[PDB]
Amino acid sequence: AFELPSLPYAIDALEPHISKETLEFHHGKHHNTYVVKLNGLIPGTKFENKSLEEIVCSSDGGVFNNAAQIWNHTFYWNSLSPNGGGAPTGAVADAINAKWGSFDAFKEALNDKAVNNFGSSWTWLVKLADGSLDIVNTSNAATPLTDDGVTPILTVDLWEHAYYIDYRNVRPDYLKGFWSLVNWEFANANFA
């Protein structure tokens, strides 16, 4: 049914911020496993012919954990880039300034939400229904995609498999890696 998407860049393209070995396990094993599991759960069910987002927004239990993780990881890979990092640009830079006053205050606010997102989790930059940006944390497979009117803009995976190989227990060091890779083109594409 579903297929694991290709990575949007070569396996060593995020070096030295996220390693090749991390992409091999994170994309090639964890993301793949969610796709295999969902496909095993859907045959001959009321989800067998629905799109992935349709499944994510209409399931619970194991179907939801697997489908939402497939979606969350594809969004995460797009949130990184070997040509990303550095200062934000375009409409998202201005929207960040409108909410937090400055990019540095936004980065401090997102780092604080990410470091403190307890357990397996995701930290998201979203555009609320009212048009403003905000930072929100979700646990396990939960995702702002299920929230009517909220538009996911970027995400950082904080499950330990996302960073343990490269950074062990030090999330702030992984977050420095993330800021060096953040894909402002994808953020702007989602914001607009």
Ligand X SMILES: OC[C@H]1O[C@H](O[C@H]2O[C@H](CO)[C@@H](O)[C@H](O)[C@H]2O)[C@H](O)[C@@H](O)[C@@H]1O
- List binding-site positions for Fe cation: 26, 73, 157, 161
Amino acid of residue 21: E
Asked if residue 139 binds a copy of itself (CB under 8 A), the reply is: yes
Among 43, 44, 118, 192, binds a copy of itself (CB under 8 A): 118
Total residues interacting with a copy of itself, rule: CB under 8 A: 18
User: Please, which residue, 25 or 103, has the CB nearer to a copy of itself?
Assistant: 25
Contact pattern from residue 3 through residue 42 relative to ligand X, giving x for each residue in contact according to CB under 6 A and a dash for the rest? ----------------------------------------
Half-sphere exposure of 75 (CA within 13 A, CB side): 26
Using the structure block, give the residue that is written with the tokens 């702030």. Answer: 172
The runs of H, that is alpha helices, within 80-156 are: 90-100, 103-115
Asked if residue 157 binds Fe ion (CB under 5 A), the reply is: yes
User: Helix, strand or coil for residue 49?
Assistant: coil
Rounded to 5 degrees, what are φ and ψ at 136? Answer: -135, 145
Half-sphere exposure of 55 (CA within 13 A, CB side): 26
Using the structure block, give the residue that is written with the tokens 């227990």. Answer: 169
Asked if residue 159 binds Fe ion (CB under 5 A), the reply is: yes
| Contact set for a copy of itself, span 32-51 (CB under 8 A) | 33
Among 3, 118, 130, 192, binds ligand X (CB under 6 A): 118
Among 89, 132, 168, 189, binds a copy of itself (CB under 8 A): 168
The sign one gets for the Cα dihedral 120, 123, 124, 128 is positive
Using alpha carbons, select from 29, 27, 4 the residue that is nearest to residue 14: 27
Asked if residue 62 binds ligand X (CB under 6 A), the reply is: yes
Asked if residue 121 binds ligand X (CB under 6 A), the reply is: yes
Using the structure block, give the residue that is written with the tokens 């969350």. Answer: 72
Q: What pairs with residue 136 in β-bridges?
A: 124
The residue ranges that bind ligand X (CB under 6 A) are 61-62, 65, 116-119, 121, 137, 139-140
Which residues of the chain form contacts with a copy of itself (CB under 8 A)?
A: 25, 29-30, 33, 65, 118-120, 139-141, 159-161, 164-165, 168-169
